[PDB]
Amino acid sequence: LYFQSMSKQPHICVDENQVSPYVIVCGEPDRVNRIVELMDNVELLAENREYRVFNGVYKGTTITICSTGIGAPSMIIAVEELKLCGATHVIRVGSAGAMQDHIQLGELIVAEGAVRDEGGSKAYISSAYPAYASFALLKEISHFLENQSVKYYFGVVRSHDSFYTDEEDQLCQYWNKKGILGADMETSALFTVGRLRGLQVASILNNVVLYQEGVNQYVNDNKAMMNGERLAAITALETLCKQ
Amino acid sequence: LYFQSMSKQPHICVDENQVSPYVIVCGEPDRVNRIVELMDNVELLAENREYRVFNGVYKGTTITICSTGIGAPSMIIAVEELKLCGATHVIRVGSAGAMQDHIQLGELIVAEGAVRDEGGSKAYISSAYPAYASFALLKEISHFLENQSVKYYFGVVRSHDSFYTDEEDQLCQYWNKKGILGADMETSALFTVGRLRGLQVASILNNVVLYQEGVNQYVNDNKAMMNGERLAAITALETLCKQ
Amino acid sequence: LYFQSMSKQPHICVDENQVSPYVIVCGEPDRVNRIVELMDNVELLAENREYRVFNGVYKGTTITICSTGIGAPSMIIAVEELKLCGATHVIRVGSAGAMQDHIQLGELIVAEGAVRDEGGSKAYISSAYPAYASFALLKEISHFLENQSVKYYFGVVRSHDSFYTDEEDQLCQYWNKKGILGADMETSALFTVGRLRGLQVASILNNVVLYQEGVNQYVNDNKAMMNGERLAAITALETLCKQ
Amino acid sequence: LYFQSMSKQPHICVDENQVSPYVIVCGEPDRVNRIVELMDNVELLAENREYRVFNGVYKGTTITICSTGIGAPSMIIAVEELKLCGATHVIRVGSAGAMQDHIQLGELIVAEGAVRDEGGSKAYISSAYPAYASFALLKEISHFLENQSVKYYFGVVRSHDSFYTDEEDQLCQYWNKKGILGADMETSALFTVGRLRGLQVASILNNVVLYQEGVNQYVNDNKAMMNGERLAAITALETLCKQ
Amino acid sequence: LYFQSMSKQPHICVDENQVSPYVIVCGEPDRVNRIVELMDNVELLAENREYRVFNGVYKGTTITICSTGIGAPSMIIAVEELKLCGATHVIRVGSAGAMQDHIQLGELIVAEGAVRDEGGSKAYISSAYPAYASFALLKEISHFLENQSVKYYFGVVRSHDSFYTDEEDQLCQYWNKKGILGADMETSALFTVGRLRGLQVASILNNVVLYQEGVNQYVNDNKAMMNGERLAAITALETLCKQ
Amino acid sequence: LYFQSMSKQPHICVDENQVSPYVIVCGEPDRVNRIVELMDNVELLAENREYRVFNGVYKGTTITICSTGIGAPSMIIAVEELKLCGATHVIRVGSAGAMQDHIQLGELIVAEGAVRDEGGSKAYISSAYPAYASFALLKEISHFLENQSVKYYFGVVRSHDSFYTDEEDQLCQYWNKKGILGADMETSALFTVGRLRGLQVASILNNVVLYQEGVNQYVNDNKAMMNGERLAAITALETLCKQ
Ligand SMILES: O=C(O)c1cccc2cc(O)ccc12
Ligand SMILES: O=C(O)c1cccc2cc(O)ccc12
Ligand SMILES: O=C(O)c1cccc2cc(O)ccc12
Ligand SMILES: O=C(O)c1cccc2cc(O)ccc12
Ligand SMILES: O=C(O)c1cccc2cc(O)ccc12
Ligand SMILES: O=C(O)c1cccc2cc(O)ccc12
């Protein structure tokens, strides 16, 4: 009761004896339960606020799965506390809204780099510092994805703090013209804070919004997005077990 | 199944028929369950990611209780979708870390104004726009609090995107000298975005960190913080049922 | 001659033995003469540049009346020197140009908060710090105004350094859409610098420009504006004598 | 009564039939009365708030003398309205605080350029735009000053919105090291806004503060500053009558 | 004479018939002459200001070699005009000053990402946009370098506009603590502008300054730097001929 | 060989025994060869990258001529190293693109002031610091130019880091309306860094682009630009030999 408040990190509620060097983070707590279905020797570590934390084993490698909620500030809390617990490699398995016409629902966006349009990373360092993915991780992600059939795109995503501003339309058109593939709320914060803490970082995003329907299409789309999530999780697991 | 995706807001997962004009928001999903214990005719509306949404009745007035997770971006999603559902008055019942020496754990900080050091509100409008609480709400909060015994402080809080930067020490000392009472991650975003959407807004914060112990003190402190949370919730409920 | 340069503040030209804790500031030197007509035991304290300084008594309370000229920099000089002389409560009785259609000439705008679009407050502190009015003062201002017949509006004003830029039209439309009630040159500087110096602060503004005429209307409008000024001064005096 | 509000500029309260193309501006209203003592055919044009406006004749040339109060915002109002009245050449006769050790009281600083650390000019144009004095005017100012005995310095001044910030000490040392000669509140705004409105502009500043005393020295210093003011006014008058 | 001004790009002085899709850029004109010594079928294309442009063949692939002078603005001119001439892959072979202790002269820094502390890229796009190297190119650079003996480092470099500011010491220590490997003047501009123009981009830097000597050591150091340059050029050539 | 690396500045490759107090800088290395044709006792000092450095004598005065390449960063390197070598007066003889309709090719723009829209000067000091030309130098430049027939214009130029951005059209129209005479890449950096290093600075620009043709006109235009360059060089030489 008291020894836990002493030993555990205050938000993710785990310690260095529990956290693997290899970690997958995702925004949605329920996604953690889905991801561990792909793994053996699964155990619940902690549940606190938006932070749901499990360990599992994939091809002999222990990997920690951690939800972080929506947005840079909740991601950054997780990244810092995971680092304190001995994390060394962190892959985000997330969702994105497409910023280019021909990206279908359930297709994947692999963030090589990210526009730092969220405030969280800016608390740490000038915006001029690059948010980009680790080469070692991208190499394995590429090797895995090129050997299957679902379409995927490597490039730049935009991370931001709100899609509900009255300028959303203007922003979407501007960023589309700059060749941004998709938008999320967290990738740039993982890339910036993680790199500064010496972590290897990457981000694999399931497309869940078209750039721009009946019950049948609705069901088909849901299945496509579920398939994309599964592919993203598998790609991350395959990448991390090879480290 | 399909009609819900049509009718419900995509994150808080409720509609205009469900949401009261009067709303309490909090960061912690489990706090919603604690708050509704103070209310009658309670019903679960939605549970999605960090958004846990209930209705209850307090002295004849229906009030919606909504968790929002940690950080401005998740708060802003909630504020926007609540507005779309017909919210008119929103009070944050939250936690803060004290920025002045003599603020004890479980004492309350009522945010008259907030430093906009989070990125979320900046997506909407120049930082020069004031984050401040609605007079109508502050009047009722003051009237209630002055008639009880727990210490409370009206003034400025700082809202930010990270307490884990290497400059945290420098920031704390700077802001202490400027007379800031406490820090959180969300108040300024509620105040800025809410006011811009025409909402009456306020924020009542339970102090959960001293500016600067045995098992006994640990238990005493936990009780004090629980008492402070309860007081904050009651103050918000008393304020909203009088609108 | 020499002892005065030693004892008096260098711009307002008064000392701590002269200044009341309770102060009204206004931009126009001649307005001071008009305000003291409402007061007893009136005495001229100092006249220097745009700073015209008088004491008077209103319902048994001594209150200092001080002009400050146009603009944040001249206001800030006054605020700092008044603070040094022992001021504790300062109310601005000023003029504004309306930023909403239905605000008539001589109606009052009570600034709950202010957009810090002037440079003066920015010299002191990041623009993210809120410019807002003190609750204690707003409560008394509201109580007084609700008991009379002239229309008044509580909300946000914009303070700025120039209404003569070629973008004035664009600014007016932008700020109108954001729900700003009116514009002046000084309120945000009083609110920011005053709060930082530990002063209770408020601002009551007479509307002197429509958002958007014969000799008869011209005379009627002048009378309306004079009536509004008188009401603003009375409201400030009633508020301060009750402290 | 009504025709005046139609014809006169709203702050300086004069029209195009009254204002000379050649104008001296100063902060202090009482300085206008002192300056016109050096001139013939003097007439009071207007008195409104901090704006005291006179015409006089110096060596056959009619020149308008206009006070502007303290600070960029009140200066800018004057510059804009003078421009509207047909001003073409404007010289500031002002005061400065020295930022270098060996500048004595009553010695003159001629601003070749100015640091735009005031908000007023920033309302008009990016800070990257240069605040500098007109060559035609500097040539005549130099020609006049080199032919007399009081020490004077050509170079950069800093214009700002407050000398009362808690960082004043840090600012003074920083700017001293950058070779700034002196500080005022208005020069950069005249230079920036005036140049943008197509005016020839210059600024001659009487030093009134040492960078860093008995009744005797106090009197001697006052005389020195009065002599410096007189020299500055004469230099401006000699320059403008030669245009 | 006249047809050339019509057909050739105005600074690099070549056209689309001359430029290969595959290009090496370097700052030093004389480095171009050294690089082409490694190539067959070499021809001088143009010589204009700091832009010295040659074609050569390396393992059957035609590659253009182009000097760009020092600094982002001259680099950006080259990138834009090369793009207009049909460039698709551009590798910078440059020099850097080390920002970490154990990087020896003539060891290589491969820029995965770059801090955009130069103004050139900022003319195009918000600093929040990432300056990073293309995965396809990094994969080949890594594959080549891991198969030889000279030490090399993948990571972040800082690109800037001056190493001669009085804050150079403070900057070096700050950036060293952030884990930056080395500094140059151009990499971030190539990465930002090149990516925006749809180019594949990379940067291989020869270390020419220790983070922190007799005639013998001087000669040894010069040889080491020459060997490093040669290695960098070979790596770029090997990478591009495989595209 | 080794003593040179010890004694010479690392980019301009000259020392204090070689550099005159009086210096002309230009962007184009080949322009140095053209300028020295106007001079006696000419000697090549150094050739390194874009830096071509010669001494010559003009009417008994030794003057150093130094090319600097394109852009602020390469200019700033030259300014700093020239200062270290004992330079005291530096005049830029450069090219500009006209920003006003009636400025013909080969007419001269004398920069009184410059918009600091390049990053190089910003590395040194806040953009609010003025980039302007030295009075002593402008006086002599004016005296010389008024006594000949080629049209010339004194006023503001804009210095920037790229003319190839997609906003070039918008920028040109904006700056044209603000009365900017012409644009280059270096003037503001010379003015800012040079003034901070205590140098007397000026800039004389040959117009080489109309704001907005057959072989005959092409040849006529080339001659006009050559004549303008010659005039600019002569003006600089006449100015410096009189110091
Ligand atoms: O359990 C599955 O095989 C599965 C099937 C469908 C969707 C899934 C999504 C995940 O994130 C993980 C696993 C799945
Ligand atoms: O259920 C309670 O009475 C209670 C008791 C203790 C702590 C509480 C905190 C809340 O937010 C709400 C209610 C309580
Ligand atoms: O003297 C008055 O009663 C009066 C009458 C009319 C306008 C006034 C304006 C003031 O600011 C103060 C007083 C008045
Ligand atoms: O009236 C004077 O001769 C005089 C004498 C002394 C100081 C002065 C200052 C001024 O600005 C103008 C004139 C004077
Ligand atoms: O010519 C060489 O083999 C050589 C030898 C030494 C250094 C070199 C540097 C280069 O950039 C290219 C080639 C070399
Ligand atoms: O050599 C010349 O007389 C000459 C003739 C034509 C153009 C010139 C340009 C220069 O920069 C310098 C000299 C000239």
Give me a quick take on this structure.
6 copies of one chain form a homohexamer. Chain A has helices spanning 2-7, 29-36, 72-84, 119-122, 135-145, 168-177, 187-196, 215-240; strands spanning 22-26, 40-48, 51-58, 61-67, 89-98, 108-117, 131-132, 152-160, 182-184, 200-209. The first copy, chain A, is an alpha/beta fold.
Domain tally of chain A:
1
CATH topology of chain A: Rossmann fold
User: What is the 3D shape of chain A?
Assistant: globular
Largest beta-sheet details of chain A: 5 strands, mixed, barrel
Share in β-strands of chain A: 25-35%
The top level CATH class name of chain A:
Alpha Beta
Order of adjacent strands in the largest pleated sheet of chain A: 5-9-8-6-10
**Distance from first to last alpha carbon of chain A:** 36 Å
Class from secondary-structure proportions of chain A: alpha/beta
Task: Kindly report the name of the CATH homologous superfamily of chain A.
Answer: Nucleoside phosphorylase domain
Largest interface: A-B, 33 and 33 residues
Oligomer: homohexamer
The H-and-E topology of chain A, N to C, reads as HEHEEEHEEHEHEHEHEH
Number of helices, where a helix is a run of at least 4 consecutive DSSP H or I residues of chain A: 8
Bound molecules: 6-hydroxynaphthalene-1-carboxylic acid
In which range does the helix fraction of chain A lie?
Answer: 25-40%
Q: Total strand count of chain A, please?
A: 10
- The CATH level-2 architecture of chain A is identified as 3-Layer(aba) Sandwich
PDB class: transferase
Keywords: structural genomics, protein structure initiative, nysgrc, PSI-Biology, New York Structural Genomics Research Consortium, transferase
Assembly: hexameric
Entry title: Crystal structure of uridine phosphorylase from vibrio fischeri es114 complexed with 6-hydroxy-1-naphthoic acid, NYSGRC Target 029520.
